Amino acid sequence: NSVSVDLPGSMKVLVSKSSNADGKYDLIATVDALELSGTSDKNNGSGVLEGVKADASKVKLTISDDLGQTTLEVFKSDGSTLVSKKVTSKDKVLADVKFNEKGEVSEKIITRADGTRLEYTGIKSDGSGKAKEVLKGYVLEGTLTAEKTTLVVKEGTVTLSKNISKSGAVSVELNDTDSSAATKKTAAWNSGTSTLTITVNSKKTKDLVFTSSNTITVQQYDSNGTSLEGSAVEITKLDEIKNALK
């Protein structure tokens, strides 16, 4: 009878082939080992299913009308306070959220469609916390405030800071405490190309590109300090970022 429907978040739902006397459709799903069930106004697998864990926590699976988004929620046993919320949106991005005993967000892990992650932990009531960005081959560590995420790499007297605004905008800055004008690094950020250009002793040395694919590339300038040379090389480990800051 029933029809299997594929869902975001690596889940499936079975929907009845025909409606009941109220015109409603039956929904069944199994998530891990838990049986969920519900009824829906629609015939395509969308709607709400509910179940209860062995420890009496309430579970709810909400499937959006167009099947683009799924939300999997766990509540305390009276159903009033959230414990966890997993949302897969239609771009296949995953937001994995944990809550404290008061239902306030305490941890949020975002997995981008390409597998890279933003990990926010120890989140406090002012929206501050610890931050990590998990990239292909390396991780960046730092902090979260309500204004921005700041991830830091240090090499010698140079500190590289990657900022992700609350609006999602990336900006990068470099600060060097070297007092010698011969070796001190400075840098300019080009928001139009997401590129940090490093200068030493009044000549450009390197472009660091922070790409839309969540990678970093480095390309050197010629000794003339005005033309790029060669071709950009993709960073594959944290040691290679540090090398670019030497």
The pair of three-digit structure tokens given for residue 90, joined into one six-digit string? 């239609």
The pairing of beta strand 11-15 with beta strand 25-31 = antiparallel
For the CA atoms of 202, 211, 151, 107, the dihedral, rounded to the nearest 10 degrees, stands at: 170
Domains defined along the chain, listed by start: 1-100 (2.40.128.160), 101-246 (3.90.930.1)
CA 163, CA 16: separation in Å to the nearest integer? 49
Number of Cβ within a 10 Å radius of residue 105: 17
Please measure the distance between the N-terminal and C-terminal CA atoms of the chain and give it in whole angstroms. Answer: 66
Identity (one letter) of the amino acid at 55?
D
Distance CA(202)–CA(6), nearest Å, equals: 58
Which residues have a Cβ under 8 Å from the Cβ of 56 and sit 6 or more positions away? 77
In contact, 130 and 140? CB cutoff 8 Å? no
- Method of structure determination: X-ray
**What is the rounded CA–CA span in Å between residue 237 and residue 246?**
15
Query: Token digits for 14?
Result: 């079975």
Q: Token digits for 191?
A: 């928001």
Residues near 123 by beta carbon (within 8 Å), at least 6 away in sequence: 105, 106, 107, 108, 129, 144
Helix (H) or strand (E) holding 240: helix 238-244
Residues 6+ apart with CB under 8 A from 223: 203
